[PDB]
């Protein structure tokens, strides 16, 4: 019935934040995005960059067009703003958890728009701001977004974790809890 | 920050059927979530969706240079990129790791595999259990790996069997009561 594979070059521009994104998606996973600050291709896995190249400059040119189209489309809509859609948040591990055996906490932030969040990992209520990582905003088929944040950790009986999420669709920050 | 937001999205989509034998190209334009125009290779011109795209439909469809560009995209864009990416995407294979433990529910935790296509089967004394199976379904980890937790309601040898494109033959993990 259905295709074997989809490749999507997904772009967005958001006003008034002036946030652009340009990324390639293969069956739901990111191949790469362009870092709009460094103006650079960022490969989701390092080895992709040994297998292929992308000229970041072409993506910056598309983003300029997207922002001009946006302003044109903002006027054509009579300034119909976006309706905030608050995210669903789930915390899981990469693998079965064993005490003192390295693992990774995944904070999955799903089905939300617009593509702006503040995400903090909390270990025993304290921010973890080194040795964490995140994805850009990944496109959904319903044209909402998802995103992933990661925390490598050593499972312990003594520690508790929260993924804290702020988004304009929520009334307060959302804490999603994990503990052994 | 209370100020109203305005979002433009563009999705250049390549759909591949039977490798590259059949390819569909969509250029899709979105205001917030609202697809307002698209180019469907199968259609061969721009069509206004939520008719905020009316201007763009006409103006773009009146630039016959653009159309031959877009009509060619299934070759110049889609089939090209498929070729570039094939080796590390279409052909990417990473083995599942399988762990069985009591949560009773007997958990078959299947982790770190690519691609997403997988069959996870529970056997009790060598017979497939077709009831009492509580599954997560496929979980995308966002790092080109998947997991799934497939739990069997139990009250003997229990074996979890995994089939996956990465494997030459089924992976089995046994739990003896």
């Amino acid at each position: 019935i259905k295709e074997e594979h989809v490749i999507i070059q997904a772009e967005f521009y958001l006003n008034p934040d002036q946030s652009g994104e340009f990324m390639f998606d293969f069956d739901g996973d990111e191949i790469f995005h362009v870092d709009m600050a460094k103006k650079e291709t960022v490969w989701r896995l390092e080895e992709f960059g040994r297998f292929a190249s992308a000229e970041a400059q072409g993506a910056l040119a598309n983003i300029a067009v997207d922002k001009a189209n946006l302003e044109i489309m903002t006027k054509r809509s009579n300034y119909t703003p976006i309706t905030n859609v608050p995210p669903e948040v789930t915390v899981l591990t990469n693998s079965p958890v064993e005490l003192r055996e390295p693992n990774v906490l995944i904070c999955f932030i799903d089905k939300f728009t617009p593509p702006v969040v503040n995400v903090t990992w909390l270990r025993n209520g304290k921010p973890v701001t080194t040795g964490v990582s995140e994805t850009v905003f990944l496109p959904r088929e319903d044209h909402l977004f998802r995103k992933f944040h990661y925390l490598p950790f050593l499972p312990s009986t003594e520690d508790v974790y929260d993924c804290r999420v702020e988004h304009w669709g929520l009334d307060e920050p959302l804490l999603k809890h994990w503990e052994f | 920050d209370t100020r109203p937001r305005f979002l433009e999205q563009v999705k250049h989509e390549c759909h591949f059927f039977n490798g590259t034998e059949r390819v569909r190209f969509l250029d899709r334009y979105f205001y917030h979530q609202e697809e307002y125009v698209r180019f469907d290779s199968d259609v061969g011109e721009y069509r206004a969706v939520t008719e905020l795209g009316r201007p763009d439909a006409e103006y773009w469809n009146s630039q016959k240079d653009l159309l031959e560009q877009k009509r060619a995209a299934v070759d110049t864009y889609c089939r090209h990129n498929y070729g570039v990416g094939e080796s590390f995407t279409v052909q990417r294979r990473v083995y599942p790791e399988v762990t069985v433990y009591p949560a009773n529910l007997l958990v078959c935790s299947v982790n770190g595999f690519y691609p997403g296509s997988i069959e996870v089967r529970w056997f009790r004394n060598g017979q497939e259990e077709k009831t009492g199976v509580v599954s997560t379904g496929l979980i995308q980890n966002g790092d080109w790996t998947f997991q799934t937790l497939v739990m069997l309601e139990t009250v003997e040898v229990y074996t979890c069997q995994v089939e996956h494109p990465s494997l030459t033959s089924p992976l089995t993990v046994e739990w003896r009561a």
Partner: peptide
């Protein structure tokens, strides 16, 4: 080998 990015047209004011 290089991925090709697809360009888009400017819209109608």
């Amino acid at each position: 080998a290089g991925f090709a990015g697809e360009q888009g047209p400017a819209g109608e004011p």
